[PDB]
Every structure is written in structure tokens, then in C-alpha cells.
């Protein structure tokens, strides 16, 4: 999408099941990983509630000490929620976990606020949330849409602030 | 009564031949079914004619279920009664 | 969903034709022969058609007939509420 | 009745919406006969000695005589019968009485007489009010079209006109009390059976009537060839009829023989 | 044995569509054909082992449909198309595209 | 469950059939092999020549090798189309009359309609929605204007002349001689020349050029379409080549291939095309070019229709006429009336009848062997697995018995060769193809089937000997006696079909005609 | 690229599952068939939202086999790139012709003609990699690839990208 | 080449049933190609 050619299937204006126009939603690695983790843990909780109906521990999964412990919790979650029949989901989740720029929800919200305060395109915002660039020109070349649309000083400020926001591992 | 009403429904006397029925507005395959096949096909092609596939002959050519008696309706599942049991 | 007629404005016959009866019996016999659950007290019968007739007798077939008007609209009638002559 | 394109060929199949196998030959008794026979058969008068009901027929025959509402009802019934005679003579100008129609009322009445062991030698417990109101209500409960606007109402009355005429012809008060001698139980049974047997004669939606009509017309056309040349037995009657005449009718030939 | 036109008409008179469909297609000649969703023709090339579906003329690899038709209907369509006529099969819900 | 394979394309049902015409662009794009040689198979006489009539990219009909384009067996390859390029355009034998009629209705020089909106008659013609009558009226009106009018009186004032851009030239009168379209110019008497209409054979390329110049409003007015039915396409430039499925070769032996007539005609077409091409580039005299073009037109015309009026019939080397494409479809035994409205079927029998006064009204006696040949696919369930197991143990040489066992996956085991009559264990959902057993519904008829009551349902009873049995009261609806009549038996193969035969067509329900 | 879309599917339920718990079987069928799939029209099917809010439609018993077909609509998060897209990813395998980069669930290949000559292939290194004056790219090295084209089949989508211009390589 | 996918015996033993339009392995009775 160098020229923002998203096609009909991925138009900026989306028609939902309610028939009202909505802005197209784009999520980076951190947002998508958090959303899928939340959905999986909610589904696990629903499954446990259903099993209790037919017939505490969940706080430790979301709060992970380390990357390896997070990966182990992810494997347990996939075993207990997915069944192990979906390898592509495991690969995507591993790719999200290994290269997640931001682990905490509040920091991800800060990144979202910083990127979308200027009102840029959701594609550019998600790309900036996915890519960490040292210099504004590096991002502008690697994101041709950002060219001619954002001042270099603003892009440099955003990139430096994002680099500062990265939580040390 | 039905035969007579069919023969005189277009405002005039329409004979039961190719000139009366095969020159009607019905579907292309239906009309080409008997006695003027290739010429009707040629004319339909040249005029860019659209067939609707609702008559018996069009559903016999395509190997489908015509809306004929038992085929005039759809059978669907009612969830309310199924759950009630 | 504009085509569907409200239940109060239904203007079709409240009896069920012979074609609808034959279609319903065939569908139920096929489903029974494909190991579907039986809703009545089977008593020594081993033929899906006869069990279909038996279920029809107590009005327990959970199916709905959709009737197509010529314009395109349709009318929904449950098998329970259709009068069957004997 | 429509076709594949949706064009209406008939606004009702057969103009009465009846199946072709639920129809038998029945005679309309109002058309034929002289005025004297009609007057004697169908007229009942509670004030003139000429046309009274014999009290040995009706259980309450003694008290009813001289009443006022009853004679008004009987007068309305007789006016209806007169209008029916006029209309029926307007339709069939030849004066013929036997036409095909649904429901064999004669067999229903005979079954009512045979099942209940009705003895004609005893008075019956019927009431004129009950007979008249029952016949009118049964007419009210005959349905082929179930619309709600006025158009469908007019169409349905037009459909059931002739059957209502026959029904009025057979169930007249004097005919019931003097010819059949039905009781209350048998009368209720007859009305219920008539309604039930009528409601099962309507045509079933989904029937392919075009191929039925074509087969019905063209099956006797195959055997028609044999006896076409019977008019060939008259040399001075060399008029086209039979296979060539049907051929010319179908082709809509512009030069007849 | 020949199941002629008179037999078909009698079965239509009775009103048994399912018997007609079973006699016509399942008992004589049933065929499965892939058709293009844009031009509505039988030109789609399908490699079933690798499930590679391609329409060369219209550059289509997504909108491709499976249809169950007799074999004589396919022969008739091909013979019609061999004389520069286009019988273009379309689907119920292809008006959206 | 047709194809014995799996595909991820969704199943759908045909709703519309939009006819039309190929553009040469479409014929080129669709095709995968430009046919080039008048030969089919190589000089080694073992494989087909690449680029010939039997190019492997089109497909194969044989059951050993698979198609090069799709790598599928002969039971799954539909067939792919070739194309042949023509030196000069050729008239299509099926639109000569329409071409001439639309030619007489349009100016031969400016390429525009002889009339416009000013005339009231044009308003009347353009008020009609029916294309056929519209074109007929426009033709019968505009066939008589041999000169294009430069100026037309105005509707508001007849004295005011408005120019419509007409060229003002004189249109000819066109007649048809065989496959040729010959025009005659009637020069104006004011020119001083005699009233002798100069005759000339109109060239197809000029007519094509004239038709290509027509506009969209005239497209709609004439009765054509912009997308599907342009008139320029009515003149052939490229000829599609049908795959070998359409023209199957019958091989008696390994080196004995009798080819179809259609491929011989196509080979002759290509031979004539290459001859005309090699004379075209050699600077031959105009007479030879005209003769070669006439021969090419004759071959292309008689390839599709071989019954053209007023011409000789293209004959085969043995003297028989060449069966064109039209003769395939037009007959009573052709595709429409012989392979699409009625066709031969499976699971059926035919035998003489007899009378049995001990049978019930709606019961038919079926011979033993005919009961041993036809089958029924019963589904194994908890209610029948014991009887079905005993039936499988019985085998195919004993009645009752079974003949095949279908698994859940579609595989089918022949019980005769598989020793496992006493070995196969049945599960839920498998199918046993068992013999036809007492009280199975069948359909039964006699030809000709003139009316509804000549095709009725019955319940079977298995009997010895070779005749069918009937009650002596159903012989009236069938118009049948027992001096040699044979009737036909058809077996349903499902539960819905069995219910239809038992609740609609039964003999008890057919008494009051 | 991650996006939220509205999807629908037709699911056939076998007659042997016709009971009061049909909704549970439909939900299990949907979850087991849809999640993790790939469709060329919408890319890989990553996840489905609002599992409790699954929309359902009335059954329509097929006239040929008795299996009830249902139409199910839902909202899903999916991944699909576009021409000219630039994405970060992880090097999977190293070859002389170029390299392969995993991005999300997909693979984008780059041919040696699509990088500047400053990046030279080193085979003696363990593992073999591409070495330049400033950027070194190897296994588990974050690399930005500008996707140039994509090929879509039934079950997967492959991609081909180029890094021929500046500001590409190791980050 | 046409081989039984269950017996896995080379060379395969195969009998063609012409009167039924079938190709049948002569050991397991499996039906290979129809029509």
C-alpha cells in the first residue's frame, strides 16, 4: 500500500452489520496481540463457567513476569482454548510475542494517542506503531504515504518519544 | 376453457404453431425446444436475449428441481419447537 | 426481510396440500434413516416412513413450510398448525 | 392461473376453483316446471288455509300457526327462490337442469335417513327459525378465497353463486319437513357433512393444470379419427368436421373449406 | 431404456419434481463444471491436486463456481460456442458483483 | 457427490443465461493454442503434432495420459478452445440476411442512419419497445430512401432547412447471389448518364469498416447491444476450434484412428487458409485471390450449415454429405430432442405382462432375476444392522442379498471379489446396495403415455418365471392386454423419491379420473 | 495488515445432529472451521470477535441430502498486505539467490537482484548471512522488506518484495 | 498406471467389469475407476 491502494475489500469507510459507516480499524502487533489474548482468556472463562454450570487463577496469565513465562502461558492458553489444530495461529502469536514493541496496555494506549493525535491515516498510524525508526527521513522513505503529509520535526519528535516509551526488557 | 383462454389472451387469435407460440416472449430455450431450434438460437444471440430459467424446459435442460408441485415451496427448520422439546 | 408477511395478514389456505404432505414425509423419512433423533414413542417399528407417519399423527414434526407468492413474497406456516385431512 | 412469465390466464381456475374429480351431475330443481308446481312445492303460508303446514308434521304445529315473524322469514325465503328462478333461467336459456357441481346432497340426506332410523310416522322436533338460520349460516361458511378487501369478497360470492342456488333448492323448509322428515340431530349432521365435503373439493395449489388440460383434450382426439367419417355417410352434408376441422381451428386458417 | 418426452410430461402432470430430477441427472449423466464468476463461461482451468483455479481471459482466480449439470448440456454449450455464440451461465447472487 | 474428487469452489445454481456474441479479442484471450498445421499426429505416428489439430494443450480423451493444461484425467477435463486466424474476413452463414437488411438501412458512405428525430415516423418507431417489430418497421420504411438528405425542414417551420451533416451520396440496391452480396448504383437521371445501375460485388472488409463506424444511439435504435451483440462481430475474423471432446476420435486399434467429420472440415478450412495466405504474399493476379477467397468462404459457410439454399452440398470422400454443426442439433435425434428432453436411464427393466387374479389391486409380480439385478442403497442404522448383516453374509448370488457396500468416504467395495461377505463389519452411515424386497415402491408404465393414468406406482412381490403380474382391473387405464405387450419398470433410489411414489402416484389414488 | 471485517459463511449440519443443542454444534463447527483459515478474498482468517454474539439464520433443508445449511455472519480480524507495502519481519532462511522473511503468518522472498550490491553473501559465517558496511542481516534479525507482489492460492498467499532502495536492511 | 491404495502390491492385479463399467482390484474387491 505505497499509494494507499487498499481496494474495495479494505476501504477506509466500512459498512457494518448495522448499516452505518465506520472508520477502518487497523491494529499493530501490540494492539492485535492484546485483543487476541483478551478474547482467548474471555473464551476460556466462558468455557469454565459453562462447565461449572453443567456440573483467581486467571489473574496470573495476563500479568507476565518475562517473555518466556508469557510464551509458556500462551502455550497453555492455546492448549486449553484452541486444541492444537491451528499451527498458523501459534506462529502468528509467537511472532507477535517476540517482536511486540510494547507489553503494557497503558503504554500501548500512550503510543496510540501519540500516533493518532495528529489525525494521520490508520494505515500510517499502525505502521508507525509496528516500526521503530531512528530518524524521520528513515520512516518517510520506508513509509511513502508519510511523505509530503507530516513535517520532519513532528515525525522526529514522535519517533524519539516512541523510542523513549519502549519498556526495557 | 383453459385452451380457449390461452389461444385468445394477447388481444388476438394466436394459433398453436411456431408462428403463434414460438414468436411469443417466453424463454429462449423453451421456444427452441421444438421445431425452430437453430434459427431461434441465432436470433437470440444476435439480439442479446436474456433467459430467466423459470420454466419447466429450462430446469430440465440444466438438471435442476423445477417448481412443480412438491417443488413449489421450501422446507425450513423451526428452532422454537425444536428447543421446546 | 421485507417479503415476509406478518402472521395476522396471512391469506393462504389453512389446510395442507398433498404435495406438501408428500414432501414432508420424504424429508422426515430421510432424516430418520440418517440416524436423527425420534420425537415419539417408537413401538416395534423399523421403517423410517412409518415412524414419519407416526410423528405426523401426533403433530410433532419440527418443520416449517415457506409458500412463495408469485411476486416473490412468502408465507411461513408451521407443520403443527396445518390441518391434515384423514 | 398463470404461466412462466407471470401473465394471468384465468383469474380463477375453472371460474369456481374446484378440482375436476370432485364434480358430479346434479339437477337444479328450480328451473324446470310450471308456476303451479313451483308454488305448491316451495310456498308455505301460515295465514291462508290453502298453503298451511299440516300440524301432524311439525311437533309445535299447533302454536306456530298465526304467527308474524315466521311468515316474514318465509316470505324472504320465497322471494329468494323467485329471484333464483329468474337468474337461473337467464343463465341457461335452454331450460336444462342437470349440470356438474360439487357435493352429492341427495346421498348425504339418504345417509342421514338411513343412519338415524328416522320414522316418517312421527312428528319432528325442528323449528322454522332453526332451519332458516342454519341454511343461511352454512352458506356463510363456504370459502374458496380468503382475502379481506371487497374485490376478493365479490370474487368469492361470484364463485359460490350457483352452488348456493342448488343448496337453497334442496333444503327448503317444506321439503325438509314434508319430504325428508329430518329431526334436529339429522339436520345438524347433514349441515356438518355438507360443509366438510365441500371444503375438501377445492383445488390444491401447485397442480400443473396445463398438461392436464392438454392431455384431456388430446386423448379423445386420437380416437376421434375412427368416427369422423360418420358424417361421410351423408353425401349432401359435405361439411368439414373431425380431424381436419380441429386442424383448421388450431391453425387459425384464413381459408376454410 | 428411453425415458422419453411423454414420460416427462406425465411426471409433470402428477407433480413429482424430485423423481424427475433423479431420473434425468443422477441416473443418466451427471457432471461437475467450474465456471467463471465474471464472464460466466466454462473456461476456468482447475488443477485439483494443487487447488489452482485460474481464468485466463478475465485474469480471475477468486470468483469461480462449481455447478452440477448434465453432460449433454455441456456438449450443447460447447457446440453453441463453436459457432461464435455465447451462452453465459450466471448465478443467483452474481448481480452484487 | 459427482466427480469423485474434492474442490473448494462453492456449489451454486444457474439463474440466468445471457446470450451474446464473441468479439475477436475474446476468442484470442480465451484460446490457449493457436492452431497452425493441417495435420494432427506426428511423423512418428505415435504422438500428436504440437500446434496441429490435436495439440495436447487442448486435452485428451484417452484414459491413460492426462491433459497438459490442467493435469487431469479424461473423466475430469472439460476441454479447452483453440483458435484459427483468417487472412480476410468471411461472412457468417447465419447472419447474411440480417447483414443485408441492416446494410440497406444505413448510408454506405457516411455510416449513419438515413433518418433522424425530425420525422414523426421515426418518433413512432422509437416509441416501440419490441426490438423485432421496431427493426421490421424501420427496415420497411427506410429501404426506399436511396439518397441521403443534407438538409431537412424544421418541425417548427417547414420553410426552414436544418443541416444534419449528411454526405448526400447515392445508395445502391443490394441483391444476394449465392454467398455474394452484389450492389447496383442507379445514377441520377440529372447526371446525364443512362439509367444503367453499375454492378459490383461488395467487399466484406468495406462492409466491416462501415459497420465499425456506427454509434451507440444507432446501436440501441437498430436493436443491438454495446456489450454483447455488436454488429461488427457478425463478420468472422478468427474461428474458434473446439476441443477433442466435441469431436472424439474412435480408435479401433493402436494405429487405427477414425477421425470425426468436424476435424476433417476444420483441416480443409486451414488448408484453404494457408493456400490463400501463400498466394496473397506472392503477388498473384487479382482473379486467383478472388477465387481463393470464394473457396475459403464456401468452406467456412458449409462448416456450420451444410443445407444452404441454392448451393451444392459439401460431400465426403465416400460421397456422403458432411454432418455440420446444425445437423447435430436440429433433428429429432439431435441434442435438444434426443439427449436433453428424453434420455436413456439406469435402474430400469422391460418385460411382457400377464394376469394374476390373486394379487391385490396395487401389487406387481417381479421376476426373480430382475430382482437380483436391480438394487437399492439402504443406510445402516441401529434398527436394521442385524438384517443387513445377514444380507451381506448372504452375498450377491442369493436372494435376498447384497451386491455392493459403500463406506462413509465414498469408496465402494464389490462384495463378489472381496471375500469379505463373512468379514466386513458394518458401521453407522455405511450403505448396503441390497436387492429389491417385497413392498418396495416402483413406477410402472406403458408407451405411448398419452394421459396421466398411464404411469402408476406399485408394490413389489418377488415371483418365479419371467413375466410381470398385474391385477385384472388396472388393464383399463393402461390400455393393455396380454397378447404380447411389454411394459417398463423404474426403481426409485432414495427416501424422498419413495415417499413421492407412495403418496402421489399410487394405484389406489387414481380411480376417479 | 491487521483489519476488522464483516464475514459470512454457509455451514451444513448433518441430520444426525438435529436436537435441542444445535446452536452448540453450529458454534463448534464455526470455530473449528473458520479460525486460522486463509481466503484470497480477505487474506488469512486470524481471529473472530464477540464469540457470544454470533449471528444466526433460519435453516433451509437441502432437497437432495437432508443436511441443514445455515448462514452465519460475524466480525473478524484478518491480515492482508497490498502492493508497495513495507513491513518488518524475521529472516527465516538464507540462500545465495536472496532471502526469505516471515511477516505475520506469511512469507516474503527477496531475490539478490533486489538489494544493493553493498550487501554481500557470507557463507562461512554461522549461520550464513548478508554483511555490509553498516547493516548485518541474519536469523532473528529484524528486517524491513518493501512488498512488491503477492500470489494468492486457496490456503496461502506468498509474497515477493524488494529492498533495492535506501533505508532498508537491518534496523 | 493404476494401483490399489490399500493392498500396495506390485504389480497390481486388476479385473475390469465391462457389464458394470467398473475397474476392480481382484484382492480387496475395491472399485478403482467407474464408467
Amino acid at each position: 500500500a505505497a499509494t494507499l491502494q487498499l481496494g474495495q475489500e479494505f476501504q477506509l469507510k466500512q459498512i457494518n452489520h448495522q448499516g452505518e459507516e465506520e472508520e477502518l480499524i487497523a491494529l499493530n502487533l501490540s494492539e492485535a496481540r492484546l485483543v487476541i489474548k483478551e478474547a482467548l482468556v474471555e473464551r476460556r472463562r466462558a468455557f469454565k463457567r459453562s462447565q461449572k454450570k453443567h456440573k483467581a487463577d486467571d489473574d496470573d496469565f495476563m500479568h507476565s513476569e518475562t517473555r518466556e513465562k508469557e510464551l509458556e502461558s500462551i502455550d497453555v492458553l492455546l492448549e486449553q482454548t484452541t486444541g492444537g489444530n491451528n499451527k498458523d495461529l501459534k506462529n502468528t502469536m509467537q511472532y507477535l510475542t517476540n517482536f511486540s514493541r510494547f507489553r503494557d496496555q497503558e503504554t500501548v494506549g500512550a503510543v496510540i494517542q501519540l500516533l493518532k493525535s495528529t489525525g494521520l491515516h490508520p494505515f500510517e498510524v499502525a505502521q508507525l506503531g509496528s516500526l521503530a525508526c531512528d530518524t524521520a527521513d528513515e520512516a518517510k522513505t520506508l513509509i511513502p504515504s508519510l511523505n509530503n503529509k507530516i513535517s520532519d520535526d513532528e515525525l522526529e519528535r514522535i519517533l524519539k518519544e516512541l523510542s523513549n516509551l519502549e519498556t526495557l526488557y | 376453457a383453459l385452451l380457449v383462454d390461452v389461444m385468445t389472451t394477447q388481444g388476438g387469435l394466436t394459433s398453436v404453431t411456431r408462428h403463434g407460440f414460438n414468436r411469443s416472449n417466453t424463454g429462449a430455450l423453451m421456444r427452441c425446444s421444438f421445431e425452430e431450434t437453430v434459427e431461434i438460437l441465432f436470433e437470440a444471440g444476435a439480439s442479446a436475449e436474456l433467459d430467466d430459467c423459470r420454466g419447466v424446459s429450462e430446469n430440465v435442460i440444466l438438471g435442476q428441481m423445477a417448481p412443480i408441485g412438491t417443488g413449489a415451496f421450501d422446507v425450513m427448520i423451526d428452532e422454537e419447537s425444536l428447543v421446546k422439546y | 426481510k421485507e417479503k415476509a408477511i406478518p402472521k395476522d395478514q396471512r391469506a393462504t389456505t389453512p389446510y395442507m396440500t398433498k404435495y406438501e404432505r408428500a414432501r414432508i414425509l420424504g424429508t422426515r423419512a430421510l432424516q430418520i434413516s440418517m440416524n436423527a433423533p425420534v420425537f415419539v414413542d417408537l413401538e416395534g417399528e423399523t421403517d423410517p416412513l412409518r415412524i414419519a407417519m407416526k410423528e405426523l399423527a401426533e403433530k410433532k414434526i419440527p418443520l416449517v413450510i415457506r409458500r412463495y407468492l408469485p411476486d416473490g413474497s412468502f408465507e411461513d406456516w408451521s407443520v403443527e398448525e396445518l390441518i391434515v385431512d384423514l | 392461473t398463470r404461466n412462466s412469465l407471470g401473465n394471468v390466464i384465468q383469474f380463477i381456475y375453472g371460474e369456481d376453483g374446484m378440482d375436476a374429480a370432485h364434480i358430479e351431475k346434479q339437477s337444479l330443481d328450480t328451473i324446470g316446471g310450471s308456476d303451479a308446481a313451483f308454488e305448491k312445492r316451495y310456498r308455505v303460508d301460515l295465514l291462508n288455509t290453502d298453503h298451511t303446514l299440516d300440524p301432524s308434521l311439525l311437533e309445535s304445529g299447533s302454536e306456530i300457526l298465526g304467527d308474524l315473524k315466521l311468515q316474514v322469514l318465509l316470505d324472504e325465503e320465497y322471494k329468494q327462490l323467485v329471484k333464483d328462478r329468474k337468474f337461473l333461467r337467464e343463465v341457461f336459456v335452454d331450460g336444462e337442469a342437470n349440470w356438474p357441481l360439487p357435493v352429492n346432497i341427495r346421498r348425504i340426506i339418504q345417509n342421514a335417513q338411513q343412519t338415524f332410523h328416522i320414522d316418517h310416522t312421527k312428528p319432528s322436533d325442528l323449528t322454522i327459525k332453526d332451519i332458516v338460520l342454519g341454511v343461511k349460516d352454512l352458506q356463510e361458511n363456504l370459502l374458496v378465497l380468503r382475502g379481506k378487501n371487497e374485490i376478493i369478497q365479490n370474487a368469492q360470492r361470484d364463485a359460490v353463486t350457483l352452488f348456493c342456488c342448488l343448496l337453497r333448492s334442496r333444503l327448503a323448509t317444506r321439503r325438509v319437513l314434508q319430504e325428508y322428515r329430518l329431526t334436529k340431530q339429522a339436520f345438524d349432521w347433514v349441515l356438518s357433512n355438507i360443509e366438510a365435503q365441500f371444503l375438501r373439493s377445492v383445488v390444491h395449489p401447485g397442480e400443473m393444470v396445463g398438461v392436464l388440460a392438454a392431455q384431456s383434450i388430446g386423448e379423445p382426439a386420437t380416437q376421434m379419427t375412427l368416427n369422423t367419417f360418420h358424417f361421410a355417410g351423408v353425401a349432401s352434408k359435405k361439411v368439414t368436421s373431425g380431424v381436419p376441422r380441429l386442424k383448421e381451428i388450431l391453425n387459425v386458417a384464413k381459408n376454410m373449406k | 431404456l428411453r425415458f422419453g418426452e411423454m414420460e416427462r410430461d406425465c411426471m409433470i402432470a402428477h407433480g413429482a419434481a424430485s423423481f424427475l430430477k433423479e431420473r434425468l441427472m443422477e441416473a443418466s449423466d451427471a457432471f461437475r463444471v467450474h465456471i467463471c464468476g465474471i464472464c460466466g463461461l466454462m473456461t476456468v482451468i482447475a488443477k485439483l491436486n494443487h487447488n489452482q483455479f485460474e481464468c485466463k481471459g478475465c485474469d480471475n482466480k477468486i470468483d469461480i463456481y462449481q455447478i452440477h449439470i448434465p453432460y449433454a448440456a455441456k456438449l450443447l454449450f460447447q457446440e453453441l460456442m463453436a459457432m461464435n455464440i455465447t451462452p453465459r451461465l450466471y448465478t443467483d447472487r452474481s448481480r452484487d458483483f | 457427490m459427482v466427480g469423485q474428487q474434492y474442490s473448494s469452489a462453492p456449489l451454486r445454481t444457474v439463474k440466468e443465461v445471457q446470450f451474446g456474441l464473441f468479439s475477436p479479442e475474446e476468442v484470442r484471450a480465451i484460446s490457449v493454442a493457436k492452431i497452425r498445421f493441417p495435420e494432427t499426429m506426428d511423423e512418428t505416428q505415435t504422438r500428436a503434432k504440437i500446434g496441429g489439430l490435436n495439440d495436447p494443450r487442448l486435452g485428451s480423451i484417452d484414459r491413460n495420459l492426462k491433459c497438459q493444461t490442467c493435469q487431469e484425467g479424461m473423466n475430469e477435463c472439460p476441454g479447452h478452445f483453440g483458435h484459427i486466424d483468417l487472412a480476410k474476413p468471411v461472412f457468417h452463414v447465419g447472419f447474411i440476411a440480417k447483414i443485408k437488411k441492416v446494410c440497406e438501412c444505413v448510408c454506405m458512405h457516411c455510416g449513419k442512419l438515413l433518418l433522424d428525430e425530425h420525422n414523426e415516423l421515426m418518433r413512432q418507431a422509437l416509441a416501440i419497445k419490441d426490438s423485432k417489430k421496431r427493426f421490421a418497421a424501420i427496415w420497411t420504411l427506410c429501404k426506399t430512401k436511396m439518397v441521403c438528405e443534407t438538409d431537412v425542414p424544421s418541425e417548427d417551420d417547414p420553410t426552414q432547412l436544418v443541416s444534419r451533416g449528411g454526405c448526400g451520396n447515392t445508395q445502391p440496391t443490394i441483391r444476394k447471389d449465392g454467398l455474394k452480396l452484389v450492389g447496383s448504383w442507379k445514377k441520377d437521371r440529372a447526371t446525364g448518364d443512362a439509367d444503367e445501375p453499375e454492378l459490383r460485388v461488395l467487399s466484406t472488409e468495406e462492409i466491416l469498416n462501415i459497420f465499425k463506424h456506427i454509434s451507440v444511439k444507432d446501436f440501441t435504435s437498430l436493436g443491438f447491444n454495446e456489450v454483447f451483440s455488436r454488429p461488427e462481430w457478425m463478420i468472422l475474423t478468427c474461428l474458434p476450434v473446439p476441443p477433442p471432446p466435441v469431436r472424439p476420435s474412435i480408435s479401433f486399434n493402436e494405429s487405427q484412428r477414425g477421425e470425426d467429420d468436424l476435424t476433417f472440415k476444420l483441416a480443409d478450412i486451414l488448408k484453404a487458409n494457408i493456400s490463400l495466405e501463400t498466394l496473397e504474399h506472392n503477388g498473384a493476379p487479382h482473379h486467383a485471390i478472388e477465387e481463393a477467397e470464394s473457396l475459403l468462404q464456401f468452406h467456412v459457410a458449409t462448416y456450420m450449415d451444410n443445407d444452404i439454399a441454392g448451393q451444392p452440398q459439401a460431400l465426403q470422400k465416400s460421397g456422403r454429405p458432411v454432418k455440420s454443426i446444425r445437423a447435430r442439433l436440429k433433428g429429432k435425434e439431435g441434442r435438444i430432442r434426443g439427449n436433453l428432453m428424453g434420455k436413456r436411464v439406469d435402474f430400469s427393466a422391460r418385460t411382457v405382462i400377464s394376469g394374476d387374479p390373486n394379487l391385490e389391486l396395487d401389487q406387481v409380480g417381479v421376476p426373480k432375476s430382475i430382482a437380483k439385478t436391480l438394487t437399492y442403497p439402504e443406510v445402516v442404522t441401529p434398527y436394521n444392522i442385524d438384517r443387513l448383516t445377514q444380507l451381506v453374509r448372504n452375498g450377491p448370488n442369493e436372494h435376498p442379498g447384497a451386491k455392493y457396500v459403500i463406506r462413509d468416504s465414498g469408496d465402494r467395495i464389490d462384495l463378489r471379489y472381496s471375500k469379505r461377505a463373512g468379514d466386513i463389519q458394518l458401521q453407522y452411515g455405511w450403505k448396503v446396495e441390497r436387492h429389491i424386497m417385497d413392498n418396495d415402491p416402483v413406477l410402472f408404465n406403458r408407451q405411448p403415455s398419452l394421459h396421466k393414468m398411464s404411469m402408476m406406482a406399485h408394490r413389489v412381490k418377488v415371483i418365479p418365471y419371467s413375466t410381470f403380474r398385474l391385477n385384472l382391473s388396472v388393464t383399463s387405464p393402461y390400455n393393455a392386454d396380454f397378447d404380447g405387450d411389454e411394459m417398463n419398470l423404474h426403481v426409485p433410489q432414495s427416501e424422498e423419491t419413495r415417499a413421492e411414489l407412495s403418496q402421489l402416484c399410487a394405484v389406489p389414488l387414481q380411480i376417479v379420473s | 495488515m491487521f483489519f476488522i471485517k464483516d464475514l459470512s459463511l454457509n455451514i451444513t449440519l448433518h441430520p444426525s445432529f438435529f436436537g435441542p443443542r444445535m446452536k452448540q454444534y453450529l458454534k463448534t463447527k464455526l470455530l473449528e472451521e473458520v479460525e486460522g483459515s486463509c481466503t484470497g478474498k480477505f487474506g488469512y482468517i486470524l481471529c473472530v470477535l464477540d464469540y457470544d454474539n454470533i449471528d444466526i439464520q433460519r435453516g433451509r433443508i437441502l432437497p437432495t441430502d437432508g443436511s441443514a445449511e445455515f448462514n452465519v455472519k460475524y466480525r473478524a480480524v484478518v491480515f492482508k498486505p497490498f502492493k508497495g507495502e513495507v513491513v518488518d519481519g524475521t529472516v527465516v532462511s538464507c540462500s545465495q539467490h536472496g532471502f526469505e522473511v516471515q511477516v505475520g503468518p506469511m512469507k516474503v522472498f527477496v531475490t539478490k537482484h533486489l538489494m544493493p550490491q553493498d550487501l554481500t553473501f557470507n557463507a562461512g559465517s554461522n549461520p550464513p548471512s548478508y554483511q555490509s558496511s553498516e547493516d548485518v542481516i541474519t536469523i532473528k534479525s529484524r528486517i524491513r522488506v518493501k512488498i512488491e507482489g503477492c500470489i494468492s492460492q486457496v490456503s496461502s498467499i506468498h509474497a515477493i518484495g524488494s529492498i533495492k532502495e535506501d533505508y532498508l536492511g537491518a534496523i | 498406471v493404476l494401483t490399489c491404495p490399500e493392498c500396495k502390491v506390485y504389480p497390481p492385479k486388476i479385473v475390469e467389469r465391462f457389464s458394470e463399467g467398473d475397474v476392480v482390484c481382484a484382492l480387496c474387491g475395491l472399485v478403482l475407476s467407474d464408467k
Side-chain angles (χ1 to χ4, degrees), chain C residues 16-19 85, chain D residues 19 22 200 202-208:
Chain C
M16 65 180 288
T17 72
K18 47 179 177 178
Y19 305 110
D85 67 327
Chain D
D19 193 318
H22 291 223
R200 305 188 301 183
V202 184
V203 64
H204 288 122
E207 176 152 29
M208 297 303 292

Side-chain angles (χ1 to χ4, degrees), chain B residues 5-6 8 10 13 18-19 24 32 34 38 56 63 67 77:
Chain B
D5 288 25
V6 175
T8 72
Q10 285 179 272
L13 264 54
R18 44 211 194 162
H19 312 313
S24 187
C32 84
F34 83 117
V38 188
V56 179
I77 279 179

Side-chain angles (χ1 to χ4, degrees), chain A residues 1 14-15 99 127 132-133, chain G residues 5-6 83 85-86 90 144:
Chain A
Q14 292 269 346
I15 302 298
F99 300 85
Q127 282 310 104
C133 311
Chain G
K5 200 58 189 172
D6 311 307
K83 188 153 194 160
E85 182 70 32
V86 180
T90 318
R144 301 198 185 191

Side-chain angles (χ1 to χ4, degrees), chain F residues 181-194:
Chain F
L181 211 62
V182 181
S184 46
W185 292 270
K186 274 185 182 184
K187 284 175 178 169
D188 214 344
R189 303 174 175 181
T191 54
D193 269 319

Side-chain angles (χ1 to χ4, degrees), chain G:
Chain G
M1 181 155 198
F2 300 94
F3 287 109
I4 288 173
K5 200 58 189 172
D6 311 307
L7 316 182
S8 76
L9 187 72
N10 290 356
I11 305 103
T12 73
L13 189 53
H14 199 255
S16 60
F17 296 82
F18 279 153
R21 315 181 224 154
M22 261 174 64
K23 267 197 180 179
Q24 321 295 334
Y25 294 113
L26 294 174
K27 291 177 184 194
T28 56
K29 204 94 167 156
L30 169 71
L31 270 298
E32 190 276 331
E33 294 293 328
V34 162
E35 297 224 343
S37 59
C38 184
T39 69
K41 202 187 171 190
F42 290 117
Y44 276 87
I45 301 298
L46 317 175
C47 199
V48 182
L49 313 182
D50 65 0
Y51 154 77
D52 299 336
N53 212 44
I54 279 164
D55 304 0
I56 206 73
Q57 206 64 250
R58 188 184 276 248
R60 184 249 166 183
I61 292 179
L62 296 193
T64 302
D65 69 27
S67 307
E69 62 86 20
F70 286 77
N71 188 3
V72 165
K73 297 173 186 171
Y74 52 83
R75 227 181 274 281
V77 181
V78 295
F79 199 91
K80 177 182 160 183
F82 294 99
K83 188 153 194 160
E85 182 70 32
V86 180
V87 288
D88 168 65
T90 318
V91 177
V92 178
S93 70
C94 277
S95 79
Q96 58 271 18
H97 327 299
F99 53 88
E100 199 158 45
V101 176
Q102 180 159 348
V103 179
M106 294 182 286
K107 314 182 187 186
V108 188
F109 206 84
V110 185
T111 318
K112 203 173 183 176
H113 323 299
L114 312 175
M115 51 215 87
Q117 207 62 45
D118 75 309
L119 278 156
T120 62
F121 171 53
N122 189 178
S125 71
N126 196 359
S129 61
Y130 286 165
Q131 297 179 346
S132 178
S133 48
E134 303 183 357
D135 281 329
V136 181
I137 310 176
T138 180
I139 306 186
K140 298 193 174 179
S141 291
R142 311 185 202 203
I143 175 173
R144 301 198 185 191
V145 179
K146 176 175 184 189
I147 301 183
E148 300 300 320
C150 294
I151 315 155
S152 70
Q153 65 182 177
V154 162
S155 62
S156 80
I157 297 167
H158 304 71
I160 287 171
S162 169
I163 53 164
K164 219 180 178 177
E165 75 261 19
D166 63 358
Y167 292 165
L168 283 146
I171 65 159

